[PDB]
């Protein structure tokens, strides 16, 4: 079943545009925030935009985008933290997290880390 990823940092839903752009939006009705999270192994997921047909990827410089193809940049550790929010940490760039800023823009992976509000998401159906 599809999920919406609600970010604790400002209450933005993770959004994947048809063109590959990634950002955040507060509108629960937005057509581009419905995501498919598929387990590739225990604790490892890909994140696909249902509307966009693109997979969330983190690049070597921390950029977030969504690609048509699934590559090693499209896998993330899904962890339930002690505060009961999930985090999604790049399987390839292992210190960097999927994250949204308070402005609704995505946060560059190299600017993220374990104590931040920006990396915390709650999956909702
Ligand atoms: C409440 O948790 C964090 O702190 C907030 C805050 O202190 O305002 C947010 O930080 C964001 O804004 C501050 C201040 O920016 S300003 O433009 O100078 O006002 C920045 O210093 C932070 O880098 C910003 N972080 S963000 O991830 O880009 O939003 C924010 O809610 C929380 O920051 S956190 O890094 O996610 O913990």
Curated annotation (Swiss-Prot):
Region (Heparin-binding): 101-117
Keywords, comma-separated and alphabetical: Angiogenesis, Developmental protein, Differentiation, Growth factor, Heparin-binding, Isopeptide bond, Methylation, Mitogen, Nucleus, Phosphoprotein, Secreted, Ubl conjugation
Protein name (database record): Fibroblast growth factor 2
Subcellular location: Secreted; Nucleus
Gene that produces this protein: FGF2
Role: Acts as a ligand for FGFR1, FGFR2, FGFR3 and FGFR4. Also acts as an integrin ligand which is required for FGF2 signaling. Binds to integrin ITGAV:ITGB3. Plays an important role in the regulation of cell survival, cell division, cell differentiation and cell migration. Functions as a potent mitogen in vitro. Can induce angiogenesis. Mediates phosphorylation of ERK1/2 and thereby promotes retinal lens fiber differentiation.
Important for interaction with integrin, annotated site positions: 101-102, 107
Modified residue annotations for Phosphotyrosine: 55
Tissue expression profile of the protein: Expressed in granulosa and cumulus cells. Expressed in hepatocellular carcinoma cells, but not in non-cancerous liver tissue.
Effect in UniProt of substituting residue 28 to E: No effect on integrin binding
Motif range (Cell attachment site): 19-21, 61-63
GO biological process: angiogenesis involved in coronary vascular morphogenesis; animal organ morphogenesis; behavioral response to ethanol; branching involved in ureteric bud morphogenesis; canonical Wnt signaling pathway; cell migration involved in sprouting angiogenesis; cellular response to mechanical stimulus; cerebellar granule cell precursor proliferation
């Amino acid at each position: 079943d599809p999920k919406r990823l609600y970010c604790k940092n400002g209450g933005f839903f993770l959004r994947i545009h048809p063109d590959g752009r990634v950002d955040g939006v507060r509108e629960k009705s937005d057509p581009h925030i419905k995501l498919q999270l598929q387990a590739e192994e225990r604790g490892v997921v890909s994140i696909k935009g249902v509307s966009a047909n693109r997979y969330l990827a983190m690049k070597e410089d921390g950029r977030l985008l969504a690609s048509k193809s699934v590559t090693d940049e499209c896998f993330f550790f899904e962890r339930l933290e002690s505060n009961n929010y999930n985090t999604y940490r790049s399987r390839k760039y292992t210190s960097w997290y999927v994250a949204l800023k308070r402005t609704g823009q995505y946060k560059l992976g190299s600017k993220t880390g374990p104590g931040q509000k920006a990396i915390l998401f709650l999956p909702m159906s």
